[PDB]
Paper text:
Enzymatic assays revealed that SULT7A1 is capable of transferring the sulfonate group from 3′-phosphoadenosine 5′-phosphosulfate to the α-carbon of α,β-unsaturated carbonyl-containing compounds, including cyclopentenone prostaglandins as representative endogenous substrates. Since members of the same SULT gene family generally share at least 45% amino acid sequence identity, the newly cloned mouse SULT was judged to belong to a novel SULT family, SULT7, and designated SULT7A1 rather than SULT6B2, as annotated in the NCBI database.
Although the overall structure of SULT7A1 with 3′-phosphoadenosine-5′-phosphate (PAP) appeared relatively similar to that of mouse SULT1D1, which catalyzes primarily the sulfonation of phenolic compounds, a unique hydrogen bond formed between His94 and Cys234 is present in the active site. Although loop-1 and segment-1 of SULT1D1 are the key regions forming the substrate entry gate, the flexible loop-1 of SULT7A1 disrupts the entry gate conserved in the other SULTs. Substrate entry gate was not observed in the SULT7A1 structure, but the flexible loop-1 and α-helix following the alternative segment-1 of SULT7A1 may form a potential substrate entry gate. Deleting Cys234 residue appeared to open the substrate entry gate, connecting to active site, formed by the flexible loop-1. Indeed, the C234A mutated SULT7A1 failed to display sulfonating activity toward 2-cylohexenone and 2-cyclopentenone over a wide range of concentrations (1–1,000 μM) tested. In addition to C234A, H51A and H94A also showed no activity to the substrates tested. These findings imply that upon docking of a substrate, the conformation of Cys234-containig loop may be altered and the substrate reaching the active site may then disrupt the hydrogen bound between Cys234 and His94, thereby gaining access to the co-substrate PAPS. It, therefore, appears that His51, His94, and Cys234 are essential residues for the C-sulfonation of α,β-unsaturated carbonyl groups and are critical to the reaction mechanism.
Author numbering: 7 to 288
Write the structure that this text describes.
């Protein structure tokens, strides 16, 4: 019985009941709900960890929404507090009802060469993921989208369509590394929360990779809270967390090919070009 399975043409972990997934639009959003959206390996925790570190904001951060049985919906309706709800769903599969309420989205994004790698790595090291021997095997799938949650490019695009909607904010991983505070603001703001220089500086302190990397047990109460449906061992996510490495895995060929598909898919995607002003200088 597989480690992965495919729903509507996209691979998912068997830890996402298909029950759960046919049932999504039966999700009943709250005007206030929040969603931290990303394609795998894209700052997810980073982001989510960052949220939790916001003080007395009143927010219960929630286990992934495409993780589990239909009941997860049950699990969800009982959170009396405001919900920040993590997901890697694509737009289409995002619950209509979320579309209908215009719940705020935060969609975080990172250049796709770095994502691929980070990823490949994740296939290697995670027993919920059917490992792949060599880098080049995984890239082919990536470029096909033959990875869980499907094609990078599609994820981003679908999402990018709503980049100019009011309850939506895009964020760039990269931009998190560069000037984390300018970012944080951008958020606090979207969320219309005030948090001061001191405080913001505390979060920065608390959330540094290596900081985030020192860890082994529990959060605010008892049973471990998972935030990425795929991940059960948080110790697995902190690998290198810089920008750039992809220059230590792409062969001149794979790059040419990559840059052409990229340029083919990300035609006139503003976001496209921004991710290019980065490795442009990076
Ligand atoms: N506080 C932090 N600062 C920078 N990068 C971080 C980080 N926390 C996690 N990461 C990076 O986030 C990536 C994982 O993404 P996700 O949260 O979606 O699973 C990893 O990339 P790397 O493989 O390059 O190290 C990890 O290194
Ligand atoms: Ca459209």
């Amino acid at each position: 019985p597989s480690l992965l399975h495919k729903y509507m043409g996209i691979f998912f972990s068997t830890m996402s009941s298909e029950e759960l997934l046919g049932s999504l639009d039966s999700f009943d959003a709250r005007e206030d709900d929040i969603f931290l959206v990303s394609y795998p390996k894209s700052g997810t925790h980073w982001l989510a960890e960052v949220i939790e570190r916001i003080p007395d904001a009143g927010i219960t951060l929630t286990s992934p929404i495409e993780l589990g049985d239909i009941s997860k919906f049950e699990e969800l309706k009982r959170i009396p507090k405001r919900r920040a709800i993590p997901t890697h769903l694509n737009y289409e599969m995002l619950p209509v009802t979320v579309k209908q309420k215009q719940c705020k989205i935060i969609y975080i994004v990172r250049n796709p060469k770095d994502t691929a790698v980070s990823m490949f790595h994740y296939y290697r090291d995670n027993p919920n993921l059917p490992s792949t021997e060599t880098w080049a095997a995984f890239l082919e799938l990536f470029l096909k989208g033959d990875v869980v949650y499907g094609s990078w490019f599609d994820h981003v695009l679908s999402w990018e369509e709503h980049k100019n909607d009011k309850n939506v904010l895009f964020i760039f991983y990269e931009e998190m590394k560069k000037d984390f505070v300018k970012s944080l603001k951008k958020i606090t703001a979207f969320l219309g929360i005030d948090v001061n220089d001191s405080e913001m500086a505390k979060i920065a302190r608390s959330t540094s990779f290596s900081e985030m990397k020192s860890n082994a047990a529990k959060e605010n109460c008892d049973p471990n809270h998972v935030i990425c449906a795929l991940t059960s061992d948080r110790n697995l996510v902190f690998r290198k967390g810089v920008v750039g490495d992809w220059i230590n895995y792409f062969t001149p060929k794979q790059n040419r090919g990559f840059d052409e598909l990229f340029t083919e898919k990300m035609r006139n995607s503003d976001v496209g070009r921004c991710l290019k002003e980065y490795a442009h200088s990076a």
